[PDB]
Design a protein around this ligand. Structure first.
Ligand SMILES: [Mg+2]
Ligand SMILES: [Mg+2]
Ligand SMILES: [Mg+2]
Ligand SMILES: [Mg+2]
Ligand SMILES: [Mg+2]
Ligand SMILES: [Mg+2]
Ligand SMILES: [Mg+2]
Ligand SMILES: [Mg+2]
Ligand SMILES: [Mg+2]
Ligand SMILES: [Mg+2]
Ligand SMILES: [Mg+2]
Ligand SMILES: [Mg+2]
Ligand SMILES: [Mg+2]
Ligand SMILES: [Zn+2]
Lengths: 52, 115, 51, 109, 108, 95, 37, 324
RNA sequence: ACCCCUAUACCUUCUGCAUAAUGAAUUAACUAGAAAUAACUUUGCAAGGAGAGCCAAAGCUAAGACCCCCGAAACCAGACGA
RNA sequence: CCGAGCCUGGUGAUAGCUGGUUGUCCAAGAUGAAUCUUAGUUCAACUUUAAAUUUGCCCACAGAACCCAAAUCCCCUUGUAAAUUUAACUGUUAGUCCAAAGAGGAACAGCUCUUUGGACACUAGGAAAAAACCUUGUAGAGAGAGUAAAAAAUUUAACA
RNA sequence: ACCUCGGAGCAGAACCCAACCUCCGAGCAGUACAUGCUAAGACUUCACCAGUCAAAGCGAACCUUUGAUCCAAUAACUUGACCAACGGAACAAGUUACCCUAGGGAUAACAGCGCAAUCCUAUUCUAGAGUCCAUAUCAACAAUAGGGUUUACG
């Protein structure tokens, strides 16, 4: 199945957004737009929110 | 289902035999209908009831004068089974203001300016 | 039919508009009736007598 | 043994018949599949509903149908037609009513 | 709309067909030592067919057999007239380039 | 609700209404859309935008809320920096 | 009862009157031809 | 019910049982061409358009073609896709041969005929040329539909045309400030002897373009008329205003249009100079104002509407306090 | 007076009751619509009203109008009873 | 009068259930959703009152899809006078039969469902008596008159 | 067995239309991570709740179905459990002929009344049997009438 995970900005901002990734898949690192920084930055998976 | 009925146009195309039978000339057709309600609107569809109310034929056997124009004719076609239509005949022309109060509608359909 | 549909188009527009103007005037003229001092004072007559 | 089938109707269809005055953004017709195609000044949503892109009068017409070449299935369907055949579809247009603005005198410098 | 004169103006499925003595199904077998020659003759015969308006269904090939190899090709044909068949096969006979094998065998 | 309280004889307010609805003085009731904080991960951006909005109530819903609250909640409040100060009154309203 | 029935369904009296009024009326071939020369 | 079609239903002529024997659209482009043809064809149903609507010379040409074919170098350049064309020579040849027809198309598209002659058309037979001398070294030409600034059009232009009298007129089809239909003339030379223009009769002196600021883009027309025999004719807007329609009505007997050339003029500081220095009036400034956005009649209870509903109908953004 | 002609008690409950559904022998007496929020109407005063508090972007104050009767089997507390 | 005594009190228990609910007269007034819900209720629709101002219904032409009939929708005119909105609001809201298109049942049911329309729950005349078929409605008095619907029809086997 | 949602027919042509009605399907996945933010005007499953579409604008770039509130958890952004009886009691089954009350003919059984599938009777046809022989007698497939005695149905 898929799991909802919290991608946290690697830009130091407190910004986080939730994505969906397969449980068997590797931990996620993704470019995403950081509103506070106003620039695309890396986000790293921190913790699993739930299993869906 | 029961619905409004669309009357085919050929129904309202008079033939020479009809012209002879009823005494109306297709050229120079009559201007005004005299319409009387001779049938109840009860047990008839609400749309026929509404058409009768529009035409002002709530009272039966009370003649009403209407224009012989296509829209009035469309309504009259809708409710033709509840009414009697006869042309309004004016042997002395339409009444003048002087004799507007001395007219009478003869049962033949003639508005005579003397009574 | 005496007139064709195109001939009848609009021949009664003026009269119909005036009739609806009359209806609108009646509808918008609705308002409480006047009140007269005479009506109020005439009630004193309930105790009118002969002296 | 037959379950389901209790879904209600979607209340789809034309919302503005021909001649109806339509303001920008008004939905003209909602359809499940492309019964009516967007014409001039008529947009299409995700769900294939037709909405007016300008303020005007709605008109329905029949026009030759030439699909987007990237529409592979439609292109193949056309490829299988005989030489004289031309596909047709019903299109919805909004005939814009007002001009898109006027020049006004502001200051007599 | 159904009641309008323009009813059915958009129908096309009737314009799409998805599915006097005349031949049956004709198979032309071309076994040739040359891939190039076999392909060229297949193209030539197909061009003759589609120029003469002959219904051609398939132009496949048989699997190779080794016992050097001979490449095999098939041409499917349907629809011939009396004189048309004569002209067709006489042209085929006269236009065979070099050491190729024709056939007018039938299906199955 | 309680039309006559047992201690004062007054009409009571349904505090469940006060916890959920804002009354604009003119007579309008504002509310949040139900589910605006629920399972946002499976809602499209348009649906989320619709859900994040402050929404007016029906006439009958407003009448119900008016009945369920007392006149204290239907007064003019001159708060310092009320975000709804401008919305507390209607303008250019014909009938 | 359904529109189609195994028995002949009873008509509305109005329909029955309509049928009676629109019954076929044969022509009278003048004076009785057999009695004629 | 079914009303029969009011004409030949499309795809009816070719409707045959011999579909397999019928040739098909092997390609998309041929279907596109056929569809465009049908779209152009008139139809009995409602359509989008209803609502949104010598021999020796030929022999010489063939011989020239054969000569170009014979030139092998030309074939090498063609097959190496390196050959080119003389643009000036092509321009001159097109002007002589069929340039008048294209210029008539351009005039019709720009609406000169409908606004100058109420739809009465003609053909610019004479390859007229106008150019406004910019500085001293160069002169910006005035083609059919060019774009020239009033700064460059400040001074009268140099006119050249291979012909033999002529009356040249300049009008501004849309510069009028009071009446929508009238127009202003800038300069009118009459009874031109042959080609030389300095000897023309200057009836109305020259004016530069004056398109008001923010009033869009104005189209200025150079008309040239063949003149059989001279006729005596006749900085104020009241006398620069007139209608070319009735003007040329008064002279069509001995005058006939034979040349045209028009251009688009925008605002420019020279326009301010024109409005102040010599027109001696305040310059008007125009702004393109769009109609106010439509909003449905405001309801007492905007059910399900966002809080912005009230802002859609409030006029003043500043807080108000009523009696307080 | 009757004879003539016309006329299928009442209430309630029902789609529909002469109904062979309910209730009623009959007389007298007794026996069943209580009130707010907001409106509307009529006064008073009016950017203010109100005899503190409350309301107020014509409001506020006062009045007028509007919310039934009988009936379980029960439950619990405390007595009284072998 | 014991599957849990009796009395008093809580207690005017509670009852979506049954019954009852008292002067005169006039007027308007009739068949979806959710619900531990279908014996009830809330919202809608309908309905009543008052108010505002301005179009409302009827409605021809034009118009509304391919796949694979009856009609409907929409609205210039026209006949008409109503409609919308604002304020306040109860009650009715899981009906009957008839005609018609269907489904289920057995091309049974005074059977059960959906749809269009009519009538009944409202007056009168008729079809024998008669909710639902037909005629007909707006109210009173008359010891006048013209009408509407409105009454079943049929009798039949020789043979060259 | 079913209870929520959706597709097709009933329901042919705007919308809408039931069922113990005839069939089918779903409780998500794939994708990307602007699949962002805002906002005119609209649609709407006949209420509400909820659910849809969307110009313009800003910002990056150059997507195709399920469930409320409260309550919890998280600094917050956000997230969860069931609520599938799928408008959702936070947590409660069997049984009563020992039963009780309030009612219900709006709802069963006997009975009455409809209906006549079933049942019964009579004719038509002769297949046919009847040693042959249709019709002394009997009788198949059927057809047409009648009855209201069974079993059922309302
Ligand atoms: Mg369905
Ligand atoms: Mg009784
Ligand atoms: Mg009872
Ligand atoms: Mg009794
Ligand atoms: Mg003892
Ligand atoms: Mg005892
Ligand atoms: Mg009680
Ligand atoms: Mg009444
Ligand atoms: Mg529940
Ligand atoms: Mg109940
Ligand atoms: Mg809705
Ligand atoms: Mg439940
Ligand atoms: Mg439920
Ligand atoms: Zn005889």
């Amino acid at each position: 199945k898929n799991i909802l995970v919290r991608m946290v900005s690697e830009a130091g901002t407190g910004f986080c957004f939730n994505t969906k990734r397969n449980r068997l898949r590797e931990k996620l690192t993704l470019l995403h737009y950081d509103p506070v920084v106003k620039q695309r930055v890396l986000f790293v998976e921190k913790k699993k929110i739930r299993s869906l | 289902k029961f619905t409004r009925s669309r009357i085919p146009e050929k129904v309202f195309q008079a033939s020479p035999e009809d012209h002879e039978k009823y005494g109306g000339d297709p050229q120079n057709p009559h201007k005004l209908h005299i319409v009387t309600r001779i049938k109840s609107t009860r047990r008839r569809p609400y749309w026929e009831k509404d058409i009768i109310k529009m035409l002002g034929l709530e009272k039966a056997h009370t003649p009403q004068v209407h224009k012989n124009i296509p829209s009035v004719n469309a309504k009259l076609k809708v409710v033709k089974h509840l009414i009697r239509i006869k042309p309004l005949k004016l042997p002395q022309g339409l009444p003048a203001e002087e004799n507007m109060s001395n007219t009478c509608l003869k049962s033949t359909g003639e508005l005579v300016v003397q009574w | 039919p005496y007139m064709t549909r195109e001939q009848e188009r609009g021949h009664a527009a003026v009269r119909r508009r005036e009739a609806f103007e009359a209806i609108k005037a009646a509808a918008t003229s609705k308002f409480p009736p006047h009140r007269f001092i005479a009506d109020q004072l005439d009630h004193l007559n309930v105790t009118k007598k002969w002296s | 043994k037959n379950l389901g089938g209790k879904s209600s109707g979607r209340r789809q269809g034309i919302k503005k018949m021909e001649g109806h005055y339509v303001h920008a953004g008004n939905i003209i017709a909602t359809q499940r599949h492309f019964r009516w195609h967007p014409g001039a000044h008529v947009g299409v949503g995700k769900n294939k509903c037709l909405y007016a892109l300008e303020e005007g009068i709605v008109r329905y017409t029949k026009e030759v149908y030439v699909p987007h070449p990237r529409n592979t299935e439609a292109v193949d369907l056309i490829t299988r037609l005989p030489k004289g055949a031309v596909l047709y579809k019903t299109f919805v247009h909004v005939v814009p009513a007002k001009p898109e603005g006027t020049f006004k005198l502001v200051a007599m410098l | 709309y159904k009641t309008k004169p323009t009813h059915g103006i958009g129908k096309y499925k009737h314009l799409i067909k998805a599915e006097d003595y005349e031949y049956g199904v004709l198979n032309i077998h071309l076994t040739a030592y040359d891939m190039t020659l076999a392909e060229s003759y297949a193209q030539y015969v197909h061009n003759l067919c589609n120029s003469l308006s002959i219904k051609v269904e398939e132009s496949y090939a048989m699997p190779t057999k080794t016992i050097l190899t001979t490449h095999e090709r098939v041409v499917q044909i349907s629809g011939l007239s009396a004189t048309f068949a004569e002209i067709f096969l006489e042209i085929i006979q006269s236009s065979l380039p070099e050491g190729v094998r024709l056939s007018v065998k039938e299906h199955t | 609700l309680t039309y006559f309280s047992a201690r004062k004889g007054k009409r009571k307010t349904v505090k469940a209404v006060i916890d959920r609805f804002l009354r604009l003085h003119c007579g309008l009731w504002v509310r949040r859309k139900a589910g605006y904080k629920k399972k946002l991960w499976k809602k499209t951006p348009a649906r989320k935008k619709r859900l994040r909005e402050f929404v007016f109530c029906n006439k009958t819903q407003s009448k119900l809320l008016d009945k369920m609250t007392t006149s204290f909640w239907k007064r003019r409040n001159w708060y310092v920096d009320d975000p709804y100060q401008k919305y507390h009154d209607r303008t250019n309203l014909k009938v | 009862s359904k529109a189609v029935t195994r028995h002949r369904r009873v008509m509305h009296f109005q329909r029955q009157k309509l049928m009676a009024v629109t019954e076929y009326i044969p022509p009278k071939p003048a004076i009785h031809p057999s009695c004629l020369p | 019910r079914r009303t029969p079609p009011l004409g030949p239903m499309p795809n009816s002529d070719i409707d045959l049982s011999n579909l397999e024997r019928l040739e098909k659209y092997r390609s998309f482009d041929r279907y596109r061409r056929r569809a465009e043809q049908e779209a152009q064809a008139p139809h009995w149903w409602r359509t989008y358009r209803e609502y949104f609507g010598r021999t020796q010379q030929l022999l010489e040409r063939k011989q020239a073609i054969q000569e170009l074919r014979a030139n092998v170098e030309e074939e090498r350049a063609a097959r190496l896709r390196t050959a080119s064309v003389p643009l000036d020579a092509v321009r001159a040849e097109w002007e002589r041969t069929c340039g008048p027809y294209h210029k008539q198309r351009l005039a019709e598209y720009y609406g000169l005929y409908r606004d100058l002659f109420h739809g009465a058309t003609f053909v610019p037979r004479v390859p007229l040329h106008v150019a406004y001398a910019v500085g001293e070294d160069d002169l910006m030409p005035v083609y059919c539909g060019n774009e020239v600034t009033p700064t460059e059009a400040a001074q009268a232009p140099e006119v050249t045309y291979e012909a033999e009298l002529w009356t040249l007129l300049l009008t501004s089809l849309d510069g009028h400030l009071l009446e929508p239909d009238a127009e202003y003339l800038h300069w009118l030379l009459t009874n031109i002897p042959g080609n030389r223009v300095a000897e023309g009769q200057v009836t109305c002196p020259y004016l530069p373009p004056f398109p008001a600021r923010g009033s869009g883009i104005h189209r200025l027309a150079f008309l040239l008329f063949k003149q059989d025999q001279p006729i005596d004719f006749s900085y104020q807007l009241a006398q620069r205003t007139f209608r070319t329609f009735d003007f040329y009505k008064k002279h069509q007997e001995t005058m006939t249009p034979a040349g045209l050339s028009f251009f688009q003029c925008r605002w420019d500081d020279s326009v301010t100079y024109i409005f102040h220095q010599l027109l001696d009036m305040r310059e008007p400034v125009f702004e393109f104002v769009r109609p106010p956005p439509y909003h449905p009649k405001q309801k007492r209870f905007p059910h399900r509407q966002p809080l912005r509903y009230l802002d859609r109908y409030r006029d003043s953004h500043e807080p108000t306090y009523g009696i307080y």
